[PDB]
Amino acid sequence: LNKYGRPMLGCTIKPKLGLSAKNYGRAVYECLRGGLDFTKDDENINSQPFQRWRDRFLFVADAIHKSQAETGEIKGHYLNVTAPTCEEMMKRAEFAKELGMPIIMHDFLTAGFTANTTLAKWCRDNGVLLHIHRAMHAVIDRQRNHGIHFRVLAKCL
Q: Check the annotation: does 12 bind a ligand.
A: yes
Q: Check whether the bond before 15 is cis (ω within 30° of 0).
A: yes
CB of 132 to a second copy, least distance (A): 13
Stretch that binds a second copy, among 33-41, 60-68, 69-77, 84-92 (CB under 8 A): 84-92
**111 belongs to the binding site for a second copy (CB under 8 A):** yes
Among 94, 112, 149, 152, binds a second copy (CB under 8 A): 112
Task: Please indicate whether residue 106 is annotated as part of the active site.
Answer: no
Phi, psi (deg, nearest 5) at residue 149: -80, 145
Q: Check the annotation: does 40 bind a ligand.
A: yes
**Catalytic entry in 3, 14, 65, 121:** 14
**7 belongs to the binding site for a second copy (CB under 8 A):** no
**135 belongs to the binding site for a second copy (CB under 8 A):** yes
**143 belongs to the binding site for a second copy (CB under 8 A):** yes
Among 13, 37, 46, 75, binds a second copy (CB under 8 A): 46
Closest CA to 20 of 56, 47, 48: 56
Considering only CA atoms, give the Rg of the chain.
Answer: 16
Identify the sign of the CA torsion 105, 98, 86, 60.
positive
Exposure b/e, 122-145, CB count within 10 A at least 16 = b: bbeeeebebbbbbbebeebbeeee
**Catalytic entry in 106, 133, 137, 155:** 133
Query: What angle, 0 to 180 degrees and rounded to 10, lies between the N-to-C axes of helices 86-98 and 113-126?
Result: 20
Please give the residue ranges that form the binding site for a second copy (CB under 8 A): 14-18, 20-22, 43-44, 46-50, 52, 54-55, 58-59, 82-87, 89, 107, 110-118, 121, 124-125, 127, 135-140, 142-143, 146-148
